[PDB]
UniProtKB/Swiss-Prot annotation, chains A, C:
Substrate binds at S158, I159, D160, R195, M202, G203, R204, E258, R286, H292, V293, Q294, R295. Mg(2+) binds at D113. Residues 385-396 are annotated as: Interdomain linker. It is an enzyme of class 2 (transferase). NCBIfam families: 6PF1K_euk. This is ATP-dependent 6-phosphofructokinase, platelet type. Catalyzes the phosphorylation of D-fructose 6-phosphate to fructose 1,6-bisphosphate by ATP, the first committing step of glycolysis. Changing S371A: Decreased interaction with ATG4B. Glycans are attached at S525. It comes from Homo sapiens (Human).
């Protein structure tokens, strides 16, 4: 719809300066391919800023073929480097001069707190740098007026995330993986020798990756620069570890921020701890500093997407910016990408440092992010069980259950749901084998020490069947009428929706279902209406994006070959699309977007023109059931006879391997995060009677920027029951974008 | 219809039953020849004849199979006509022989027995090492002739097991103009 | 066949004491399930040795269901711990006593150098320990004669591999993964900031994982305790790094052994190096000590197999041992598992430390393994290019090529082949696009700096097509001359085999094919006759064994479900079998082992009796084409209608996702290792003219314990050309075993 508006003729320079984080390539890829799409010239700037000063070999134009085959790699191919000869006007001039020699009037910088502030100045000094170049007569006197205005745009890029202008900065999810990967491995070595480990994650300033990772591996204790330990923590920690040996947890994991501190700026080294536990508890302890393995590695799905979206929203922001409009720093807020003023953002970032240095920790917290406070609170109120007798019991029965297909990171949702329940004063009942078990009586009260160590496990434990209750609506109520069940917590997918939607029926027929029930999105499909995201979704999506890279391997080894992969996920083309954009597929056929033999024919042509360039590979993803006639076989059958002579092609039907492996850190948190707020909505609405109106049975889920409880009742509207997909689907806005990155 | 790569059965049968199109191997075709034929089948679904018959040679294409052909025609009609698929089994080569075969079998088989009796009398008062010592009797022009299996290596596609030059392909344009 | 004479009555004790290495669980799983199959009782011994002293809660019987769902986990579920109260007779008695109370007469210890020596004494003191127990009257006076003989067996288990009794110890391949995983990640952060890293791998005594890993990531320099650096290494290292910057290698990786030393016992810390390079080169440098992430993580395929095979060969050795027979320590030698004397093994291990301490490094090397010397030699002679002019050129043209399907770890074979060639005095010619390109003239001379950094990349670069060299022999001959080629190396699967064989008898024909030619196994199928292994085999097998665990996830979440996965790999059921044993499949239908509707029927029954126990999952692998009638659909179609009411079931057809991803560390080495010895066979046989015979065209591959060059000629015998698989296949001996383990 906005493809028309495209500033052409002009050029843009792209560079990378700062903590080389994963997904950085996927960014410069969206920038180059988009910059060309709009009809402008895109130049490369090696060694970040240093490349500008130097020039010549550090500046070259980039073709569509250039940024190809780099999306699936960490670090940055453009190269990064700290340039000091730029922080000085005496040399910042050489940079400017070199730009006019190439005709670049716009620039896109992908760095960090400082790197951005660099261009913020260059932007201003420009009018002053051209005055000197024209004066000394080093550049054509004409140029002094053609390239008078200088537009720049910054981009969030560093695993630190010490930036409050955006919730997530390109790299976080990637580095977060690297951290969890190391831990999940270490946990097997500690669960044997029954010892305790102390880890040191990155983040000299922001203690973000230090908290999210911890919540992701159900850590025992965390040390953050923003929220230091209350005086007297030394004995309070040993209290925990002392109880963890008494509860039989032969494993203890300690997460420490690179810049840990206590009530006073006094640093909290990881050794100062190793000493504390072994010299006061006697437990064998080993501390390890996670190497730069946090900035390297393969970019996760989330990172590639965010990167590829930012790279575009940045290109448009460059030619859609006025000579007097503030410097913009594209960033993902809530769910939709939005540009923000650079200066104002660096301010917030610096302010966090200000508060911390002035023992104002309490304020420095609500300054890093309005989700950060909620995360710390969620973690702690879930990693500490105040004595059994100090918890005011409510004498109510709340039950949890897993209805639907198993989704990675589901056990994580149960761990939270249970603990946030017991710690709230309720007795927990676990319904095994989904509904199938519910009716059979497979119910058992579980405890706190029970759901311990699940945040890391995938698949399901309490079982889970897509078994609809619509016909066993009796055997169920009959069970609740013999367990004191006064609450319910479903965790699944669309199957669960129909579950509550049906339950509400037998209320004027069965006085037992007349209780509070809250469903939480838990499916790899993400077809759950009333939420833009689902638990275990980002996991499979990560498994898919990965597998596509390994398939793009055999497609490159053997020149001129195309692959057709059939991703699963009912009619919901979520998985199919997000994965196609994350692996850079030439096309992804989802159901939600109709297509005839022509949309297909007109795409085989584009695939042929690619078998001329360097990229002699081909990748096309197809939604499990996007069409009843054009099947995985059909698509392949056509592509073969229509290519015959130009390229080869095969087909693969991704099995359930997707929804299987260990849950992605994003699910390890999502599962734990939005499930607690689901448990309080219960405690809060269960206290109201301390239930009729069709609403006490809703579905908590991500909507705008934050989650909200929507009564399953009013969700009947925006939902396609025939294809089992929500009517309005947000990720369709990426459709035009996703494709312009094809050709 | 079956019959290896030889689209004979497929073609002669399609012309005899008035099939809208018979896709044989001997005559290549892309998704366009297929597309441009679904259109003609739609314009017929306007007249009195609301039927459609398309024959496909057992293996005229490795990609475009009976299911493919049907899978396309279904989605490409959706709203104008319905369609199903049938794979003629060995029921074809089974029943009692047709009177033309009851004769052909007996007819050209006798003249094949004499060619033996006659080439037994040749080198009687006079061994076989020539190339015309093991030939194949078959209808060529107007009449049959014995061609040594030797010089037949030329006009024969061993890969698909079909003779290179096939006469009944002259009926291709005809066969189709009769299908509208 | 040999499962005839088993054994009952008596009982066996299993424990784990030492460096908890991955795959340890997969070991105790084979011991338990096997000890039961033989008809004996198997007891658990928690906390390694400490459990023996204690007793009671640290000793329990294990059922078939027990050791289930642990195979795919690192560390040890039995628990490990160092017990000092055992190194003393005063307490070693409490251990013995507790054993008679449970009726255990046999024992299997899975530990290390020290842990094993422990039972070696216990074995002897036994007669003396029962003398005191009967005297003091603590155990029934009768028992003093029923349990008079004490049989024990040790098992290689520790990632150190500081054991010379066995080539590989349960854990190596797994810890080697963890190491390579960390590196491959760090290399992206270093290839950006163009810096140098110093890594510190484990191995306080043996510098194994330090050499193998290095060779796997094409490291720049290594430090080993057995082969220290020649006096004057300080400047020699800087010489390298100085040239790597001159050759444009914006990345330098340094691998240091945990116990590195120089000509003298003087330790070589990783810091002592960080100082050296930065204080003498000025390059930015960061050193990181790979934490215990080397002992943790998920066990690799190689590890699980070796583990599962050792656990069995151990069980049989226990009951097949006489009262006066030396203590045995099962270990994999060459390719077939063989038991060896404990004491005699510990001697060798202790002797390596002896030599090192006495500056006898030269002997200490040929004492750790007869392959070690060949590996160190391979690495070094491939990481240092003596000046261009100091290399006696031979003025000969040797060309390499990739024929067949792309196999992970193929580029690695080219890197080696190329360098070992230039460093031998030959000019290297690279044939792109396999044969298809060979006939096209896609030939180009490559250099040393060209094939730099390939040992880590998967897929292929020189392209690779399954096209045979037949139909275009002339387009290959004419070209052959244009470059005046003399030697041709091949990196392909069965495809290449047919290549060499077609070129053999095609000599008298085209006089251009009369020269030395050597092929090397490079296919994920492993159908290459004349070699027990193939390049890229262990990779796909690792991806398969992984994917199966992710599927075994969704099969456990939804109780009572069976999956049918169709692995690829022509008729060669290699992939299908090894993967089935590595993931614990209930059955794997390969071609090499015929089966009727009865073997199938009699297996669905076994699957039903499992749906009664705790394990309500089901996994069955089927070879791509093991039967023309019983296809993946058929197997599923039967299993469904035959279970209907007891269990559900689905089917998955693994795509080319197997042979795709980054090559496994075992392939990264195999490719480089046995590829050089293939290049020397050329340099050695081309200097013989200082060429039309059956001994000029051969297939270099693994046979007995070591590789050997077998003329493609005599290989026509042991090869099934109709199904493309070697007649005699070694891994078929594991068939009975594989099955008794799964039941
Ligand atoms: N105040 C400044 N003025 C101008 N350029 C700056 C300034 N601060 C940083 N830079 C530029 O950006 C580069 C990166 O600095 P750094 O603080 O390391 O970035 P980041 O915050 O991403 O880690 C410097 O080498 C310089 O080129
Ligand atoms: N002579 C001995 N007698 C009894 N136990 C021993 C003896 N030597 C070693 N051990 C046991 O093995 C432990 C030593 O660790 P070890 O097994 O050598 O580790 P690793 O598996 O890494 O090689 C001791 O704590 C003890 O439990």
């Amino acid at each position: 719809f906005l493809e028309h508006l495209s500033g052409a003729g002009k050029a843009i320079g792209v560079l990378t300066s700062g903590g080389d984080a994963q997904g950085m390539n996927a960014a410069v890829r969206a920038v180059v391919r988009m910059g060309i799409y709009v009809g402008a010239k895109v130049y490369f700037i090696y060694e970040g800023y240093q490349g500008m000063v130097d020039g010549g070999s550090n500046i070259a134009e980039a073709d569509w073929e250039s940024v190809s085959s780099i999306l699936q790699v960490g670090g940055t191919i453009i190269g990064s480097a700290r340039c000091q000869a730029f922080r000085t006007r005496e040399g910042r001039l050489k940079a400017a001069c070199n730009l006019l020699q190439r005709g670049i009037t716009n620039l896109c910088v992908i760095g960090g707190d400082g790197s951005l502030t660099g261009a913020n100045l260059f932007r201003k000094e420009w009018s002053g740098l051209l005055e000197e170049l024209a004066r000394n007569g080093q550049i054509d006197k004409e140029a002094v007026q053609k390239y008078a205005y200088l537009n720049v745009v910054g981009m969030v890029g560093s695993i630190d995330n010490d930036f409050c202008g955006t919730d997530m900065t390109i790299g976080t999810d990637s580095a977060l993986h690297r951290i969890i990967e190391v831990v999940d491995a270490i946990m097997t070595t500690a669960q044997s020798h029954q010892r305790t480990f102390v880890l040191e994650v990155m983040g000299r300033h922001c203690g973000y990756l230090a908290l999210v990772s911890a919540l992701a591996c159900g850590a025992d204790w965390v040390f953050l620069p923003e929220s230091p330990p209350e005086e007297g923590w030394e004995e309070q920690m040993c209290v925990k570890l002392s109880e963890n040996r008494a509860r039989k947890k032969r494993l203890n994991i300690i997460i420490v921020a690179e810049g840990a501190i206590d009530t006073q700026n006094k640093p909290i080294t990881s050794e100062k701890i190793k000493e504390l536990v072994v010299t006061q508890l006697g437990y064998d302890t080993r501390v390890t500093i996670l190497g730069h393995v946090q900035r390297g590695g393969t970019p996760s799905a989330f990172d590639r997407i965010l990167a590829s979206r930012m790279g575009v929203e940045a290109v448009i922001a460059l030619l859609e910016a006025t000579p007097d409009t503030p410097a913009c720093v594209v960033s993902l807020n809530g769910n939709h990408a939005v540009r923000l003023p650079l200066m104002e953002c660096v301010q917030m970032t610096q302010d966090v440092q200000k508060a911390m240095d002035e023992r104002r920790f309490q304020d420095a917290v609500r300054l890093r992010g309005r989700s950060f406070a909620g995360n710390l609170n969620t973690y702690k109120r879930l990693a500490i069980k105040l004595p059994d007798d100090q918890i005011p019991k409510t004498n109510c029965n709340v039950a949890v259950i897993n209805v639907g297909a198993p989704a990675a990171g589901m056990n994580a949702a149960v761990r939270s749901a249970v603990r946030v329940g017991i710690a709230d004063g309720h007795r927990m009942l676990a319904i095994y084998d989904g509904f199938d078990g519910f009716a059979k009586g497979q119910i058992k009260e579980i405890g706190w020490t029970d759901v311990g160590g699940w945040t890391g496990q995938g698949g399901s434990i309490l079982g889970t069947k897509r078994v609809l209750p619509g016909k066993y609506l009796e055997e169920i109520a009959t069970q609740m009428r013999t367990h004191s069940i006064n609450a319910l917590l479903i965790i699944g997918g669309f199957e669960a929706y129909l579950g509550l939607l049906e339950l509400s029926a037998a209320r004027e027929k069965h006085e037992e279902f007349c209780v509070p029930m809250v469903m939480v999105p838990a499916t790899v499909s993400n077809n759950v209406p009333g939420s833009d995201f689902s638990i275990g979704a980002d996991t499979a999506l990560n498994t898919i994006t990965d597998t596509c890279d390994r398939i793009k391997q055999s497609a490159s080894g053997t020149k001129r070959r195309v692959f057709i992969i059939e991703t699963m996920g009912g009619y919901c083309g979520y998985l199919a699309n997000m994965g196609g954009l994350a692996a850079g597929a030439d096309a992804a056929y989802i159901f939600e977007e109709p297509f005839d033999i022509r949309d297909l024919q007109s795409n085989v042509e584009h695939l042929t023109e690619k078998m001329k360039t360097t990229i002699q590979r081909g990748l096309v993803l197809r939604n499990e059931s996007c069409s009843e006639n054009y099947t995985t076989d059909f698509i392949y059958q056509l592509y073969s006879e229509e290519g015959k002579g130009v390229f080869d092609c095969r087909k693969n039907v991704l099995g359930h391997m997707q929804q299987g492996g260990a849950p992605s850190p994003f699910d390890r948190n999502f599962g734990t995060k939005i499930s607690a707020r689901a448990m309080e909505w219960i405690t809060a609405k269960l206290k109201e009677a301390r239930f009729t109106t069709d609403d006490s049975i809703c579905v908590l889920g991500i909507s705008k920027r934050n989650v909200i409880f929507q009564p399953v009742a009013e969700l009947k509207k925006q939902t396609d029951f025939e294809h089992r997909i929500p009517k309005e689907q947000w990720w369709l806005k990426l459709r035009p974008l996703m494709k312009i990155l094809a050709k | 219809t079956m019959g290896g790569y030889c689209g004979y059965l497929a073609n002669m049968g399609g012309l005899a039953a008035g099939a809208d199109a018979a896709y044989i191997f001997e005559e290549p075709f892309d998704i366009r020849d297929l597309q441009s034929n679904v259109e003609h089948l739609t314009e017929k679904m306007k007249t009195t004849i609301q039927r459609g018959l398309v024959l496909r040679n057992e293996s005229c294409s490795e990609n475009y199979t009976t299911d493919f052909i049907y899978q396309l025609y279904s989605e490409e009609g959706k709203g104008v006509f319905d369609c199903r698929k049938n794979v003629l089994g060995h029921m074809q080569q089974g029943g009692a022989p047709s009177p033309f075969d009851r004769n052909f079998g007996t007819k050209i088989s006798a003249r094949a027995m004499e060619w033996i009796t006659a080439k037994l009398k040749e080198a009687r008062g006079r061994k076989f090492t020539t190339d015309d010592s093991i030939c194949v009797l078959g209808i060529s022009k107007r009449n049959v002739i014995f061609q040594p299996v030797a010089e037949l290596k030329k006009q024969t596609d061993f890969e698909h097991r079909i003779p290179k030059e096939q006469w009944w392909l002259k009926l291709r344009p005809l066969m189709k103009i009769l299908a509208k």
